[PDB]
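Researcher: Predict the fold of interferon stimulated gene 20kDa.
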Amino acid sequence: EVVAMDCEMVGLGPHRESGLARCSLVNVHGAVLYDKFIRPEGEITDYRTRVSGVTPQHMVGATPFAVARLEILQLLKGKLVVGHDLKHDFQALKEDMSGYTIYDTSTDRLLWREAKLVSLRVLSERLLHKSIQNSLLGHSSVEDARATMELYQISQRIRARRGLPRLA
Ligand SMILES: O=c1ccn([C@@H]2O[C@H](COP(=O)(O)O)[C@@H](O)[C@H]2O)c(=O)[nH]1
Ligand SMILES: [Mn+2]
Ligand SMILES: [Mn+2]
Ligand SMILES: [Mn+2]
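Model: Structure tokens for interferon stimulated gene 20kDa follow.
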């Protein structure tokens, strides 16, 4: 009933607007449920390779945006969606967030307080003692998704240890 998601984006059009180029979904244990490079809907004007890890070769034969979007939305349907600053991911997915139940590490005040500070890298470093997004190949949405899921588990356990009910 819980799934963590992270997407990587490239720049589209003359104004290099963020466009969905990769999406990774993992379960509560970090098992990868979905991981695909996606052809965004528009002209790629900036691969942002150093950060997105997306190269023009990755886009060759990649799943069309409209198709991947349906696959991802189907997997998120009815579940608690875990992630960091999910607002931007749903914008990339061109999907209204309203009906979704989410858990966002970027707005979890508990993690904020415990980290004594919101970037996912900082939270991961201070609370998970895990260094992420350091590869010269670019960020890994699988690693980023796992980091948010781990942060979610930590938050739930801290709440439990302090006598607080777990987040619904
Ligand atoms: O310093 C950054 C961080 C993120 N992004 C964009 O945001 C996407 C998601 O970033 P993240 O989920 O790895 O933080 C990247 O694939 C990239 O398009 C950047 O351009 N620069
Ligand atoms: Mn992200
Ligand atoms: Mn933001
Ligand atoms: Mn990422």
